[PDB]
Amino acid sequence: GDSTTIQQNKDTLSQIVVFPTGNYDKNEANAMVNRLANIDGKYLNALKQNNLKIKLLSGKLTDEKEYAYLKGVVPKGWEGTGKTWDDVPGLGGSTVALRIGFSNKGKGHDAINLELHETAHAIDHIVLNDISKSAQFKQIFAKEGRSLGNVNYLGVYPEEFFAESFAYYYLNQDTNSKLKSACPQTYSFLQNLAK
């Protein structure tokens, strides 16, 4: 095809994205925002309507004043390695905060791309009003919820199954074909949300 949808979507992301104060990888930051521009303008416009910002980081999480209490708190599975939220690869909630180079697979998380996955935790719980609670989805989540692995993440919150399957549905065609083959009803659910 062409780049027209991506050019509009990267310009819509400009309106809600926040970069570091200096000393960061500008090609990988802009490539993260391009990988998120490749998703859908309807959800990008809806997060812009909801003023939900994209915080790109290259430093301590505790250097943002909204995470100043988040120094010694220990997240699930990091007690055994002695680690805290201050060094997290990225997170989501009232805002999504994302660490350049650490949102890559295998940097202290098992997700295939944590950028798109934490962004999808925002699309789900802002734009779709947490559709992951809904019993029609839940029948499929109980059927197919772990056929793409990552089971000590996809077994903790329902946004994890949605966002990992959504990342397999957006990131690359080998992951499209793997999700279609492993979670077939889930691809038929996701196409009906996406259309």
Q: Which residues contact 179 (CB under 8 A, 6 or more apart)?
A: 148, 165, 168, 169, 186, 187
Residue closer to Zn ion, measured from CB, 124 or 160 = 160
Binding span for Zn ion by CB under 5 A among 54-62, 134-142, 154-162, 176-184: 154-162
Read off the tokens for 110.
């098992």
Binding span for Zn ion by CB under 5 A among 25-33, 96-104, 156-164, 167-175: 156-164
**Closest separation between CB of residue 117 and Zn ion, Å?**
5
**Closest separation between CB of residue 179 and Zn ion, Å?**
16
Name the burial class of residue 106, with classes exposed (0-12), middle (13-18) and buried (19+) by CB atoms within 10 angstroms of its CB: exposed
Between CA 172 and CA 87 the distance in angstroms is 28
With contact defined as beta carbons under 8 Å apart, do 61 and 103 qualify? Answer: no
DSSP 8-state secondary structure symbol assigned to residue 105: T
Among 115, 124, 144, 160, binds Zn ion (CB under 5 A): 160
**Closest separation between CB of residue 121 and Zn ion, Å?**
6
144 binding Zn ion? (CB under 5 A): no
**Closest separation between CB of residue 160 and Zn ion, Å?**
4
Does 170 carry a binding-site annotation? no
At residue 194's C-alpha, the angle toward residues 118 and 109, to 5°, is 20
Residue closer to Zn ion, measured from CB, 124 or 144 = 124
159 is catalytic: no
Nearest to 167 by CA among 128, 122, 125, 111: 111
Does 121 carry a binding-site annotation? yes
Which is the catalytic residue, given 118, 144, 159, 164?
A: 118
Does 153 carry a binding-site annotation? yes
The one-letter amino acid code at 53 reads K
Rule CB under 5 A: which residues touch Zn ion? Answer: 160
Known binding-site residues for Zn(2+) equal: 117, 121, 153, 160
**Which residues are marked as active site?**
118
